[PDB]
Design a protein around this ligand. Sequence first.
Ligand SMILES: [Ca+2]
Ligand SMILES: [Cl-]
Ligand SMILES: [Mg+2]
Length: 187
Amino acid sequence: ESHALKDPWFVSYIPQLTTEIVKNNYEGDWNLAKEALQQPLDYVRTVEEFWSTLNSLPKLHQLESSSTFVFARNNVDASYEAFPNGTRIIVDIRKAAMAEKATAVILSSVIGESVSQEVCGGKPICDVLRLSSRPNKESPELVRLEVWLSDQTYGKAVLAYVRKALNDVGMSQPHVIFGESLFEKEK
Ligand SMILES: [Ca+2]
Ligand SMILES: [Cl-]
Ligand SMILES: [Mg+2]
């Protein structure tokens, strides 16, 4: 007795890219780069499949992979340009011993529709989730989680909800950092 997800999520991994590499090889189109370079993992359709696929991922906090893992609702295009008026919520997890649980909390909150129900009036707004290793000199095991929203007017409220969710299960500054980045600004 599987439990269906509200929507299926297409899960893949992509190599690390840069604006210049995408400009020079993929006509500036990050979605084309993704289509050209991704490897599929699964199209998750049930709660059980979600957990199976998540548990199969590399330990990004142990530098097992340089790839970005993407979860895309209904296989939506995962480029900024496919999110007009959108924003990204960034969650940086500095503490390696918290990365797996933070990832589980954030991904399950969205894929299980808690964010939609509790923040967005039941409308699907969070349509892409990304997960990457992003070490820096201050934080050599940093994992970066991104939540991409189709409508920037929900950004502050989604951030607050996800922050509270993490705080409630033991994860707060300085172990995790939150930010928001409008797609129109970044572009
Ligand atoms: Ca296509
Ligand atoms: Cl915090
Ligand atoms: Mg499958």
